[PDB]
Amino acid sequence: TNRLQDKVAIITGGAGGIGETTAKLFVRYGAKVVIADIADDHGQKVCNNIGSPDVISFVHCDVTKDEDVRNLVDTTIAKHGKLDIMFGNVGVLSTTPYSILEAGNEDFKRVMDINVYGAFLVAKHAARVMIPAKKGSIVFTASISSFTAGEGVSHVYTATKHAVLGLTTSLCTELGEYGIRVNCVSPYIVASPLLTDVFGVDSSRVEELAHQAANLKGTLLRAEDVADAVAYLAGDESKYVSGLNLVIDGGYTRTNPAFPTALKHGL
Amino acid sequence: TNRLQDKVAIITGGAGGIGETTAKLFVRYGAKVVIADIADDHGQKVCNNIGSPDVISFVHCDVTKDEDVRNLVDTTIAKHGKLDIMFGNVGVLSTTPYSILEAGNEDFKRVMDINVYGAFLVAKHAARVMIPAKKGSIVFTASISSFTAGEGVSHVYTATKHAVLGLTTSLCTELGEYGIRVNCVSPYIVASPLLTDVFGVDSSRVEELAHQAANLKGTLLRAEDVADAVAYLAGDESKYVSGLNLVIDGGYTRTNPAFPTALKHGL
Amino acid sequence: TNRLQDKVAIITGGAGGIGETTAKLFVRYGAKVVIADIADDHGQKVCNNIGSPDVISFVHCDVTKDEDVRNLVDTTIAKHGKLDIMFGNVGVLSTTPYSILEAGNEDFKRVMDINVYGAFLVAKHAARVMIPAKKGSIVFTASISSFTAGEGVSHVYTATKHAVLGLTTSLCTELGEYGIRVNCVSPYIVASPLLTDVFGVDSSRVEELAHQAANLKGTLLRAEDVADAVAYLAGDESKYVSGLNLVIDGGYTRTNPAFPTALKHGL
Amino acid sequence: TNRLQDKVAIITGGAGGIGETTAKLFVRYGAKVVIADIADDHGQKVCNNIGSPDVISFVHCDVTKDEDVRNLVDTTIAKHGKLDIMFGNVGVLSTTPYSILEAGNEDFKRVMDINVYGAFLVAKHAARVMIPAKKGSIVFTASISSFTAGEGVSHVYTATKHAVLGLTTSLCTELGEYGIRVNCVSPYIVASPLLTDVFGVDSSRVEELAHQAANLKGTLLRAEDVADAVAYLAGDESKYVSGLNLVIDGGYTRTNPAFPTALKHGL
Ligand SMILES: NC(=O)c1ccc[n+]([C@@H]2O[C@H](COP(=O)([O-])OP(=O)([O-])OC[C@H]3O[C@@H](n4cnc5c(N)[nH+]cnc54)[C@H](O)[C@@H]3O)[C@@H](O)[C@H]2O)c1
Ligand SMILES: NC(=O)c1ccc[n+]([C@@H]2O[C@H](COP(=O)([O-])OP(=O)([O-])OC[C@H]3O[C@@H](n4cnc5c(N)[nH+]cnc54)[C@H](O)[C@@H]3O)[C@@H](O)[C@H]2O)c1
Ligand SMILES: NC(=O)c1ccc[n+]([C@@H]2O[C@H](COP(=O)([O-])OP(=O)([O-])OC[C@H]3O[C@@H](n4cnc5c(N)[nH+]cnc54)[C@H](O)[C@@H]3O)[C@@H](O)[C@H]2O)c1
Ligand SMILES: NC(=O)c1ccc[n+]([C@@H]2O[C@H](COP(=O)([O-])OP(=O)([O-])OC[C@H]3O[C@@H](n4cnc5c(N)[nH+]cnc54)[C@H](O)[C@@H]3O)[C@@H](O)[C@H]2O)c1
Ligand SMILES: COc1cc(C[C@H]2COC(=O)[C@@H]2Cc2ccc(O)c(OC)c2)ccc1O
Ligand SMILES: COc1cc(C[C@H]2COC(=O)[C@@H]2Cc2ccc(O)c(OC)c2)ccc1O
Ligand SMILES: COc1cc(C[C@H]2COC(=O)[C@@H]2Cc2ccc(O)c(OC)c2)ccc1O
Ligand SMILES: COc1cc(C[C@H]2COC(=O)[C@@H]2Cc2ccc(O)c(OC)c2)ccc1O
């Protein structure tokens, strides 16, 4: 109820699936939260859902705009007098096909922009008000695409989630000297939010297939489980971990099962 | 106070520095704990320190003896009716010099025995009473020597802490199908327990030097911080993570600073 | 003399230190080479140095311009009738200070542009003329900053050399199905080319300090040694390796020596 | 024909599939080779196949016996006056079932013995005659099981191929200071030698299934391709690489394809 008693957090991408569950869970633990996002009304329905303006508020922030990240942070210092936690949770997918041949050049630029520079800007301004307090935890959401590939996950998303781990490792080596921890969380498929762009995509259905394909049975990965991993990294109880890419895939990425399924027996 | 309400845990190596702080912290969180060890009287002073026989008890167990691991587990099922958590925390150092030339062949065998087979045996018997309950978390203590080297850490200790990550990754791929999570924790120097074998070794003093050499300043790594990492992995809040080697080094292993210190400027 | 007999290669960044030694070594092995670069006259003195126009030629190509990468590749197909090898060896450093606080936003964009999109564009057009031949090796130069950090290596260079490994792993998973291998080479400090921007930087002198700080003694890392690693990956003898980040650091990144040097003995 | 002109090599496990192709290829490159093995007559038919006693000879050596590794090395110094290359290529599989529950305790001990201590002993005696020459390359065969898991690859084989990478990384950090490089090679399924223990196992047939399951199409992984990777590491052209686990899996381990195949489209 108060494990994060004290704390002031900013959730970048906080109107979304992992961002709202995380904010909900940081409020349940005693913190003051600022959800930041470009999705206006969804960001407002999320906040005014969870608690009152005294604990959560919404700020518009387009994290590829430095004037907006400057404003998001300076508005959190003016509201709550400090910054303990920054969770940089913005990420977008590609909107061109997977093959390198049909993968767009503009699309590459823009996914690189939202996903990596957007994370650089967030760490830049959080490090501005955390270095003088000589305390802080910056948590980035990377992905299991921060170290593996997948047929169907575009080459710019893999390249961008590797560069997010790249800033995690790099910021960690600069900032641990000011007592600031930098970590990232690498989830597998997080369950929803009821999906159609193509057809197939429906989101009782993507977790059903994520279970087919899962190492680890009997549990569904939901946003609540990533939330618990960044609540650990964010506060409470993780004050000597800064190395970390905290993979939350139930062990999916520890094996490639293609030659074992080609193994089998009984015919 | 009750985050681990329910739980039945076995701490292998539980009379030692990381093992006692962990057991202390699992009792503070509502669990029933069995400390297992070859250090008789220290294991008894640790238990009878923490709480009453109703929550913690001591069992003698030499984890390179399968009859003793069989007995440690069957005695936990007979006392508490189940097994939720197994923390395999036994590890020993080498007692021959570092150079491959002076590194002992008997010593190699025996460190391999305590550190790897001892961990295989613990997972073997815990998996015996966890697979029918189709629930469980096995946590191993590995080390940052599970993926790096160090001048002065013997070649059998590096090779054994890599093989502990090897069983972590391997058991994870077998057991996630019975809903059992397998993880390991990789700490940097954990502070004590007031050390002399050589001279130099004194243990207000090893953390002082671990801070010299540390990425991350202003905090000392103590057994309480590894304890918090295995309490996360053990229960509460980590039920879709099974991939993990949870490094707790404040970012030490993310850089080699030798060519940056050879960089400098001011002469 | 003819180990690469047949071969047609493009060296992106080929007027530079690793690019010219590599081209020199692919010509010594029987290949036809196209050096591509924005450094006009240096690219021309490199080519007209090595051999005649029948084996090496220079093309101007600014690898952040797709019309120029389109032209570099189509000019190699028109000259030599095919494309066997693409070595994407362009990389730039940061020109703002290391601290996240003083690290430039424009500089981030531009280093991201040259180093990652520039590599995406090279793989995009090489994959255009390699997929119909269903043969090919794409080699990228990443860095040991593709998986570690360093005080003094800017946060955009770490983030960009992680994203180059990201495209290596991702392109490998797409293109191995057309028989195309994708690899990268991760060198430590490569010796020169006689350096001043600041003072200190002089390049008999940087390898002297790279030896101070080196795992592995008695050898200096020079461009000839990276050249040998990409000649292996490029042809000859590596036709079932596609996973690879081929680290060429003499073991530098396998240890952090800060707590061992804080260890020592004799006082 | 003479790329390895000079060289004196020991192939541990050299009567086997990867060991004989490697020895064949080191003789074709100008070296003097000593195949070492417990398979007597097969080791003799391999040697007396390849060339005369002046270049290859067979020594019996059970690499879990230090008196035999002492003898194998001292017999190579007495025959050829030096030691340039040590390739520790012994490995055995498990002979108990995969499940941790049915995995044998004696079998664990013995696979640990052949695979890890056997590699420790080889590096121990090679480092004896290489440190005074202050030159040398020790190459170990690890496996892709040195960093991943597989259903059906026993928990002691994963744990042993991780500990072989553990000694590779550890020996590298000790021995690079005497100018000695330590590397390992991690192959996927190497094609044969015409297999029955169970039925299914036949070895035109295992490469057929290794291709089903392969990243990288159109090539079969054969012992000749691992041979080329250890010839690179062993001599010629790799004299600043010592970090390395040289994966030769055509990219198999860079992806887990289970959720992409659960993705698909057309129904
Ligand atoms: N959901 C998964 O299965 C999955 C897996 C692994 C990693 N991730 C990452 O997890 C993070 C959160 O994703 P999610 O919650 O699943 O998706 P989501 O529901 O799309 O939430 C992400 C939020 O980012 C917001 N956003 C986009 N651009 C900007 C911008 N430029 N400025 C400010 N806000 C912006 C967007 O409005 C959205 O609410 C992202 O980094 C993902 O890439 C997702
Ligand atoms: N302390 C550090 O700085 C450090 C760093 C990284 C990893 N580790 C690992 O952390 C684990 C715990 O170590 P610690 O608490 O620092 O040391 P410790 O105080 O030596 O505790 C380990 C316990 O293992 C016990 N033990 C030894 N052999 C057996 C056996 N065969 N059967 C049963 N019990 C046995 C021993 O009595 C001791 O109490 C070990 O695996 C270490 O290798 C330690
Ligand atoms: N040299 C080292 O110590 C070191 C270490 C690790 C990795 N690397 C990487 O190795 C690669 C080669 O670097 P190097 O040979 O040392 O440096 P270099 O001498 O600067 O050569 C790189 C070449 O890239 C060229 N270039 C820059 N921008 C463009 C552009 N947009 N279009 C076309 N050409 C361009 C540039 O003219 C130069 O000749 C780069 O990716 C480095 O980042 C270098
Ligand atoms: N073949 C594959 O698909 C595969 C994949 C990945 C790694 N590996 C490893 O590659 C290495 C070579 O295996 P391979 O050539 O396929 O198999 P192999 O044909 O069994 O050859 C290995 C040799 O080791 C020999 N040997 C066994 N015990 C001893 C001993 N105690 N002392 C001396 N010699 C002994 C044995 O006689 C055999 O000839 C081993 O380390 C494997 O574990 C194999
Ligand atoms: C099992 O691995 C992953 C796969 C998925 C499924 C997709 C959503 O996010 C991804 O990266 C996946 C596939 C995808 C589809 C379309 C794209 O536009 C895209 O590229 C950016 C990616 C999710 C998390 C995992 O981590
Ligand atoms: C910074 O890295 C580490 C170094 C240390 C210091 C030593 C204790 O445990 C080790 O492995 C270290 C060195 C050492 C000394 C003597 C030995 O007998 C031994 O070999 C087994 C190891 C601790 C944790 C770290 O993870
Ligand atoms: C030991 O590690 C490395 C360090 C170096 C030395 C520098 C040149 O390239 C780098 O990345 C290093 C430091 C540096 C200085 C100034 C910068 O502008 C820069 O940022 C982009 C980097 C080279 C290769 C290594 O791999
Ligand atoms: C795709 O991955 C691998 C799988 C294989 C197939 C088997 C032979 O070696 C292995 O480790 C695999 C499976 C296996 C079967 C029986 C066992 O006794 C054993 O355990 C030791 C292992 C080979 C190389 C790969 O690297």
CSV table of C-alpha atoms and ligand atoms in Angstrom, one decimal, chain A residues 256 258-260 263, chain D residues 92-98 107 111 115 142-146 148-158 160-161 186-190 195 206 210 213 221 248-249 252-253, ligand 8:
chain,number,residue,atom,x,y,z
A,256,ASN,CA,14.9,-22.4,-30.3
A,258,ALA,CA,12.7,-26.0,-34.2
A,259,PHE,CA,15.1,-28.9,-34.3
A,260,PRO,CA,13.5,-30.6,-31.1
A,263,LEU,CA,13.2,-34.5,-33.4
D,92,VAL,CA,30.2,-36.8,-24.7
D,93,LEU,CA,26.5,-36.8,-24.5
D,94,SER,CA,24.3,-38.1,-21.7
D,95,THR,CA,23.1,-41.7,-21.5
D,96,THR,CA,20.1,-41.1,-19.1
D,97,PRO,CA,16.8,-39.5,-20.2
D,98,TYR,CA,16.3,-35.7,-20.4
D,107,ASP,CA,26.0,-39.9,-15.5
D,111,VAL,CA,29.7,-36.1,-18.4
D,115,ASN,CA,33.5,-32.5,-20.8
D,142,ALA,CA,31.7,-25.8,-26.9
D,143,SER,CA,28.3,-26.0,-28.5
D,144,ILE,CA,25.2,-23.6,-29.1
D,145,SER,CA,24.3,-25.3,-25.7
D,146,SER,CA,27.0,-23.1,-24.2
D,148,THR,CA,20.9,-21.9,-25.0
D,149,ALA,CA,18.7,-24.9,-24.0
D,150,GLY,CA,16.9,-27.5,-26.0
D,151,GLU,CA,14.2,-30.0,-25.3
D,152,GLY,CA,16.0,-33.2,-25.5
D,153,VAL,CA,19.6,-31.9,-24.8
D,154,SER,CA,20.2,-33.1,-21.2
D,155,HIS,CA,20.7,-30.7,-18.4
D,156,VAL,CA,24.4,-32.0,-17.7
D,157,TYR,CA,25.4,-31.3,-21.4
D,158,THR,CA,24.0,-27.7,-21.3
D,160,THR,CA,29.0,-28.7,-19.2
D,161,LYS,CA,29.0,-26.7,-22.5
D,186,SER,CA,29.9,-23.5,-30.9
D,187,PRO,CA,28.5,-25.6,-33.7
D,188,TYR,CA,24.8,-26.6,-34.4
D,189,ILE,CA,24.2,-30.3,-35.7
D,190,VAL,CA,27.2,-31.6,-37.5
D,195,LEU,CA,24.1,-43.1,-36.1
D,206,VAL,CA,19.9,-36.0,-39.3
D,210,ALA,CA,18.7,-30.0,-39.3
D,213,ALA,CA,14.8,-26.7,-38.6
D,221,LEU,CA,26.6,-27.8,-41.7
D,248,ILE,CA,28.5,-21.7,-36.3
D,249,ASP,CA,24.8,-22.3,-36.6
D,252,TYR,CA,19.6,-20.8,-35.7
D,253,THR,CA,20.0,-19.4,-32.2
E,8,LIG,C1,20.0,-27.6,-32.1
E,8,LIG,O1,20.9,-28.0,-31.0
E,8,LIG,C2,21.7,-29.1,-31.1
E,8,LIG,C3,21.1,-30.3,-31.2
E,8,LIG,C4,21.8,-31.4,-31.6
E,8,LIG,C5,21.2,-32.8,-31.6
E,8,LIG,C6,21.8,-33.6,-30.4
E,8,LIG,C7,23.2,-34.2,-30.3
E,8,LIG,O2,23.9,-33.3,-29.4
E,8,LIG,C8,23.0,-32.6,-28.7
E,8,LIG,O3,23.3,-32.0,-27.7
E,8,LIG,C9,21.6,-33.0,-29.1
E,8,LIG,C10,20.4,-33.7,-28.4
E,8,LIG,C11,20.8,-34.7,-27.4
E,8,LIG,C12,20.3,-36.0,-27.5
E,8,LIG,C13,20.6,-36.9,-26.5
E,8,LIG,C14,21.4,-36.6,-25.5
E,8,LIG,O4,22.0,-37.6,-24.8
E,8,LIG,C15,21.9,-35.3,-25.4
E,8,LIG,O5,22.3,-34.9,-24.2
E,8,LIG,C16,23.7,-34.8,-23.8
E,8,LIG,C17,21.6,-34.4,-26.4
E,8,LIG,C18,23.1,-31.2,-32.0
E,8,LIG,C19,23.7,-30.0,-32.0
E,8,LIG,C20,23.0,-28.9,-31.5
E,8,LIG,O6,23.8,-28.0,-30.9
